[PDB]
């Protein structure tokens, strides 16, 4: 009753994320904040 090995359950695509350029600059700002003092 596990997901099928063949199809959208492909190890090649099971993992794929999506982004908005707005959320792209948001995450890099999180990296900018990493600069201490």
């Amino acid at each position: 009753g596990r997901l099928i090995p063949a199809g959208t359950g492909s190890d090649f695509v099971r993992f794929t994320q999506v982004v908005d350029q707005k959320t792209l600059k948001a995450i890099e700002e999180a990296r900018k904040e990493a600069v201490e003092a």
Binding site: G1, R2, L3, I4, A6, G7, T8, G9, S10
Partner: protein, 243 residues
């Protein structure tokens, strides 16, 4: 309860043409004959060549005769009516059809003549004969001119019509479409089960599994194996989640 005919119902003549009602048309626009009388049912031709029962096409012809001649007949099994005898009664019918038409006061349409043009070019009527004589020929063949009804124009090329007997078939309990959302469940196997008032789920067979397997329907198949039928804790959180 009264069961008036409807789009879900299936009718079929004694020959074997079986089939379902797909559309109930308003008398307003279905095929109508020269004299205002319109057709009740329109049977597809294509269903006749492949199958091999011209017997129906023979019935409709003798029928056309019985309609205008106001008479019923008895054609035995293999000894019955013969192609010439029918053409003979059709001949008698042409007079009741078109004879009254002569006396009632009118002749032939632009339409009636037009379809004749296309009919001679076809090869159904001996070129050079008068429309009156031509229509007799064309009628004897078992077809008559028909106008659209929706446009009032004619249907290029004679079409046969006639009195065919058709029965209506009994609706089995399965007919009653079974649509189930959520319902009982078997005690030992935890798969959906119906009975009295809850419809009972449909079976997802291997042949059907593969169908999904072939597609990239990963989740859609998991669902069919989990959320929809056996995942006890799944279907529960499933419903509520949907809710």
């Amino acid at each position: 309860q009264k069961r008036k005919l409807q789009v879900g119902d299936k009718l079929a003549n004694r020959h074997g043409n079986k089939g379902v009602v797909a559309k109930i048309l308003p008398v307003e626009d279905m095929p109508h004959l020269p004299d205002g009388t319109p057709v009740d049912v329109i049977l597809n031709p294509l269903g006749v060549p492949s199958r091999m029962n011209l017997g129906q096409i023979l019935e409709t012809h003798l029928g056309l005769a019985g309609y205008f001649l106001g008479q019923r007949y008895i054609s035995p099994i293999f000894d019955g009516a013969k192609e010439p005898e029918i053409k003979e009664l059709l001949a008698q019918a042409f007079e009741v059809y078109f004879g009254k038409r002569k006396g009632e006061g009118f002749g032939v349409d632009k339409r009636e003549v037009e379809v004749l043009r296309r009919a001679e070019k076809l090869g159904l009527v001996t070129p050079g004969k008068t429309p009156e004589e031509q229509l007799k020929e064309l009628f004897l063949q078992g077809k008559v001119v028909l106008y659209d009804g929706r446009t009032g124009e004619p249907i290029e090329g004679p079409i046969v019509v006639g009195q065919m007997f058709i029965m209506k078939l009994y609706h089995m309990v399965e007919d009653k479409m079974h649509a189930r959302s959520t319902g009982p469940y078997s005690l030992i196997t935890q798969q959906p089960l119906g009975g009295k008032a809850q419809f009972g789920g449909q079976r997802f067979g291997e042949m059907e599994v593969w169908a999904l397997e072939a597609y990239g329907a990963a989740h859609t198949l998991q669902e069919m194996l989990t959320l929809k039928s056996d995942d006890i804790e799944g279907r529960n959180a499933a419903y509520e989640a949907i809710i």
